[PDB]
Amino acid sequence: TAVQKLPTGIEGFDDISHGGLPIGRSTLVSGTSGTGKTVFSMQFLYNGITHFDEPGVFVTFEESPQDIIKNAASFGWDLQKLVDEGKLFILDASPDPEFDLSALIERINYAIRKYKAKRVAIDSVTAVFQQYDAASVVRREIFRLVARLKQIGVTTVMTTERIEEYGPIARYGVEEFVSDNVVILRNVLEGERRRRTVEILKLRGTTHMKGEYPFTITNHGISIFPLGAMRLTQRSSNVRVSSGVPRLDEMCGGGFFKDSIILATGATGTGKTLLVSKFLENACRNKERAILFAYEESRAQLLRNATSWGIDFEEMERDGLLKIICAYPESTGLEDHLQIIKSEISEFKPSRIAIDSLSALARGVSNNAFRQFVIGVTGYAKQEEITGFFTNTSDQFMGSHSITDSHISTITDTIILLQYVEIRGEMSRAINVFKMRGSWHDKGIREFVISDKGPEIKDSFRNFERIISGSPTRIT
Amino acid sequence: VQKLPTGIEGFDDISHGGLPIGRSTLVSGTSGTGKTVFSMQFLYNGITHFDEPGVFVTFEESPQDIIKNAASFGWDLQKLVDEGKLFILDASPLSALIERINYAIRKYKAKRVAIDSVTAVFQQYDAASVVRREIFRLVARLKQIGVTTVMTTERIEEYGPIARYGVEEFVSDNVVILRNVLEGERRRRTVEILKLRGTTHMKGEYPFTITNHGISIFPLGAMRLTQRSSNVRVSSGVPRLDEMCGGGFFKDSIILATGATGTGKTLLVSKFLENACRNKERAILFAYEESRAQLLRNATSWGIDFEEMERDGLLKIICAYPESTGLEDHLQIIKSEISEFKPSRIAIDSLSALARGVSNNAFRQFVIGVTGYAKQEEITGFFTNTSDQFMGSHSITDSHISTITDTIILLQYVEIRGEMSRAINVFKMRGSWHDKGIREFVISDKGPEIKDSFRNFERIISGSPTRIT
Amino acid sequence: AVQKLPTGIEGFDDISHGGLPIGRSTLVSGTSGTGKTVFSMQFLYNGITHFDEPGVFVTFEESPQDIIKNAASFGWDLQKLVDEGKLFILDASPDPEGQEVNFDLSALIERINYAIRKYKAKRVAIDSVTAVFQQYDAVVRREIFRLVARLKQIGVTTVMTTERIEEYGPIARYGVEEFVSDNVVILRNVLEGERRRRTVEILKLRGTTHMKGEYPFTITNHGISIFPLGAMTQRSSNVRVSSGVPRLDEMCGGGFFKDSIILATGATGTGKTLLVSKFLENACRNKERAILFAYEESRAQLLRNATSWGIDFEEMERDGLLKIICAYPESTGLEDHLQIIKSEISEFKPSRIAIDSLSALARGVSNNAFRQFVIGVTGYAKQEEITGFFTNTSDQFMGSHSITDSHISTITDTIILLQYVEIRGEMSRAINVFKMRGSWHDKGIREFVISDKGPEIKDSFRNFERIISGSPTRI
């Protein structure tokens, strides 16, 4: 007879809550303005009706029912229908535009019975206390409301308000301790960018995932990405795919594995976009779909620079085997980027993917949040059986030294190292398969030349030393 | 939830269309952020562009002061007031006020309203509960009438509470935060849309500037990677370099010349703009290091006369110190001067100068800004960067500015036989073959003379090479 | 359109883009000892002495006698101006003995009004408005608005002094004054390390433009003097001057330029001060005035070390062609240092100048502050067409292992690079004209020897590699 839970239906919340929200109990969902308290509370009710056939009541202390309905239309929720079918009831407790909570408790109970409601949402409880002038019996009244609802036996969501993101959990510093369950929505301003996070602080009598988890409000409501939950569990096969460059495929011991993450690390101009461009060509030639995620160059530039290499991307676009998705890294946050990726993938249903580049997306953002992105993208592709080619521009121009994020290096199956080499007063370029995981790879640091045809991988600088430096020395 | 176009330059992009119609939007900020401007600009555009009358509720600032202050932006509000398009309700010493607004709304058939400042109307004793109940009224009543409102609120802190009483945010359907952050000894204006209930919006802060045209927002995010790209070449002025670039620079490209002090970046800039005026192409030089006088002289020593170019009306030398203004302003200056002169080529000497006393993320927003604006307007951009190490040549514009540039010319010193020789190298050239040689070049009265490469040397990049065998 | 009134305070009219809006009230807030009372007195004083605009100064504490007395330090005979009826100080100080009581400012309004007309005052100053409430209770917003409006009707440009508790905190005390005032100026005395820095910021000028951010100022005998770097043209000529060393002149294509900023960079004891000494010796040899600004060595030592190089500074000090201004960097702030330099240049009217060294002035200061110093000094020298030889000591001993770590390279026109070089188990020296804008320069890392006669630049190290490292190798 332990605390059983009720599915919310919100992508990720049931995972981080190890089931859902405790049944017959109230959950405080606190946050600042614009965190997604109302969306969460509505989505809890909406998913109740549509998925589980559980009617719900929505208590509003300010926002008009008509306004609540119009705001949900963005998500594609016809709340007018649910209202017209007695599946949703919006109790208007908003003041007229022209003391102890007890009457309202009666009105709610009447409604719950009338519409046979199993879920309730109250938004916001902090309002009535201010709207009137309590700020003195907050604990008493919140305790009453919680207790009376426990009697009715309804799963409740209570919206609270905060001022500071990493400050007190609520306004009166009392609502948290009365509530059985506490969830915190945050919208943290880092640099000049916001990040939405959800935390389940407390679930009395049950287990939950601790810490903040990133989420996004899309046209499908709140979508949490259980970064921690996503488990290391894939398929992995010895099936190979080609790079579009034959000598490289020989250097990779037949070609890239289908279930793989490929990284091309090198200085600027080393020729990473060409490797990417050839990898997508190969897909479209083998009658496979692919998506290019550009974060550095426009389509026009990509198309031009490709046609110089002799790769017609438009023909692939027209054929329906290629989709170039161009966007500035600061066009949104890494959280939304990953969603746009995941969404675009689901639509086109690609076999191969390419992000150009990762170093561009790591502009300004913390090394932590970037790690979360990489793992998120890496994991999605390996789970969805999509081969992934990633690019990374090294800051050091000469040779190679290391990788910015140690996470990337260990999260990639294959590492292609492009570098520059000074040979007889000329800037040569060299390619090397540094890592393959599960195959033989050529252990050579081979010269290559970029031409109108593309990459021409030549032989190793055998008669040179200190090639990794970028400034070698010929040894007779 | 449909939206009304504000007409504010960049806001309708950040807000994904504009402000929701019929609803009220809270615009909070400290003094001098630009709340009254936004509110005036909102109404102004309402009537001049969309033929929507507006009512402006003032609580302290006199009607005539509002008209006097607006004149700076070039807004004849009195003309509009006379023509019965704008009404300024003077509430300077809520049911009563609301009744007066409703009357004014109908009297002028107004579709937009601006209330500034609401915090002042509660500046008696009204506290928390009173403010929440009272604001709720105003917002609700305004919603009933059928008018799109902009409501001004005050802050005491830039990254603290959004308003005063910590109540106005939760009541309002829409929240916009205006900030003026003192970063060191320079202020930076920024707009953030925190909340737009019922629809989507661009999140995060975005920089803006109050100009003689009012609030002008330049979103780095809304900037789409959707510029054009051609195979049309343009010359550097140095023919050996054009041959090294496989015909020349591209018309649709950003050029970077990186190197130590005295390596000759400004010479390459001089010859670049010389070629432009030689082909009757208009060009601007945004100089942040030297002065017009010293540039003219040092160019004349190179056999380059900027004075004639300027007289012809093809060259514009804009000199300014990086510390004179913030990077947000500098960008507005660059954009503005470009829009007037309509140049085909542009030059910034140097980017490294503008980086002095600024964050990497701010300088990134700047570079990303200018780069993009040049590419979208089809303007060739020769940028310069001075490396701090004068021989090591370890990195180039070490701030991820390389991924933004299409061409990289690396200038360096080379220690040959106890002499300090120079070298030029086309490091990168997207979409073209480039000479892979680290060619020696010598500056003269005539200019840069690119010679042959150091074949019989090693460790050239180090700056201290070794003669082989 | 909002017209502005020239304050007369040095720099304020530049940062205010004209001055203070006419017929409008300006708030000038700051902590204790920021110069709020100075600014206000200076506003009125200048008003009278420059534009024949009478003024009225309202005090709620300090007696007229004291205000007149304190102003004497700036050389302002306010009693003269009071006697002529050009200035009036309305004493509204609390009665020595009395009792207390809502508060209304209707009484003072009419007292100020009366005096305004009586003295025909164009300018007015209130100091400090905070005190008048800090003597009873806080109505502030309403009472502030009342005064601003009444004074607006009268059409007098007013300065309202207000007091703060923290430097980077609330603009005023009660969190209201700011919003009610049309114009806001924040004076700050920021404590960094253990040194104070005075800064002016115009936060807001309704209906007008202004320079944003903080700008440094100093309070002297002249009063408040603000130094906007953004306000700053420098002309250029192909006229050569000599370094004092004939070989270096050759290496610099026939000498330094008259319109140039020379920088000498190197490790300690590489010989920057010798080149400085020779540079100045030439000016005096060509009957030209020069000033040496030293921040490392005393006058006595400089002279001793100079005479050991065969340079008599005393004769040129006596002949009135040389002024040696010695002072520690920590004696003042860079804001002050710069004003000492500008002032000393204005007096002597030199043709050449020298700072020995810039590296010393950078000690224990903000990188931003030191930048603003160099941009200022270098700008003023180029402005007045004064040739400037600056010194910089690199912390790295051997060779030019790294460059100048201060981002000065872009300002300096000529860069002389002194370095050490180990040759056959012995520390040698070297000179190189690294940069020379507008001239050919010898591109050679020439050996150079110091002696009793002074510098002897010699031949290059042609038979050596890795010279710049400081540890070469014989080919």
Ligand SMILES: Nc1ncnc2c1ncn2[C@@H]1O[C@H](COP(=O)(O)OP(=O)(O)NP(=O)(O)O)[C@@H](O)[C@H]1O
């Ligand atoms: N269709 C949509 N797509 C993307 N984002 C959306 C969409 N609809 C709403 N949003 C976002 O969700 C916000 C509304 O969240 P909401 O749940 O109303 O916040 P809240 O925390 O309840 N606000 P408050 O009542 O002031 O405390 C909007 O301001 C947008 O940022």
Ligand SMILES: Nc1ncnc2c1ncn2[C@@H]1O[C@H](COP(=O)(O)OP(=O)(O)NP(=O)(O)O)[C@@H](O)[C@H]1O
């Ligand atoms: N048509 C061409 N012929 C020969 N070489 C070319 C051609 N186009 C490009 N290149 C070479 O390839 C480089 C650009 O390759 P690219 O794949 O864009 O590299 P990258 O590492 O992705 N560059 P970046 O994004 O700026 O860091 C140029 O600098 C040239 O060296």
Ligand SMILES: Nc1ncnc2c1ncn2[C@@H]1O[C@H](COP(=O)(O)OP(=O)(O)NP(=O)(O)O)[C@@H](O)[C@H]1O
């Ligand atoms: N008349 C001339 N004859 C020969 N060389 C000259 C002449 N004028 C200038 N130079 C050379 O040009 C160099 C300066 O070139 P410039 O274009 O100013 O380089 P830069 O790297 O842009 N300098 P900076 O802005 O100080 O970092 C000098 O160091 C000289 O070697």
Ligand SMILES: Nc1ncnc2c1ncn2[C@@H]1O[C@H](COP(=O)(O)OP(=O)(O)NP(=O)(O)O)[C@@H](O)[C@H]1O
């Ligand atoms: N013509 C103009 N050109 C440029 N900037 C201007 C112009 N007019 C006003 N400004 C700027 O805008 C500021 C005034 O903006 P405004 O909207 O009146 O401030 P506010 O934030 O409403 N002040 P407050 O009511 O006290 O909280 C001035 O201080 C200037 O910085």
Ligand SMILES: Nc1ncnc2c1ncn2[C@@H]1O[C@H](COP(=O)(O)OP(=O)(O)NP(=O)(O)O)[C@@H](O)[C@H]1O
């Ligand atoms: N009579 C002399 N004969 C030879 N060499 C001398 C003589 N007097 C001084 N020197 C040299 O000159 C050096 C000091 O030169 P100076 O111009 O003071 O250099 P600096 O770089 O300015 N030194 P510092 O201020 O400590 O960083 C000494 O270390 C000696 O090597």
Ligand SMILES: [Mg+2]
């Ligand atoms: Mg809400």
Ligand SMILES: [Mg+2]
């Ligand atoms: Mg690339």
Ligand SMILES: [Mg+2]
């Ligand atoms: Mg205002």
Ligand SMILES: [Mg+2]
């Ligand atoms: Mg230059």
Ligand SMILES: [Mg+2]
């Ligand atoms: Mg005082």
Ligand SMILES: [Mg+2]
């Ligand atoms: Mg010395």
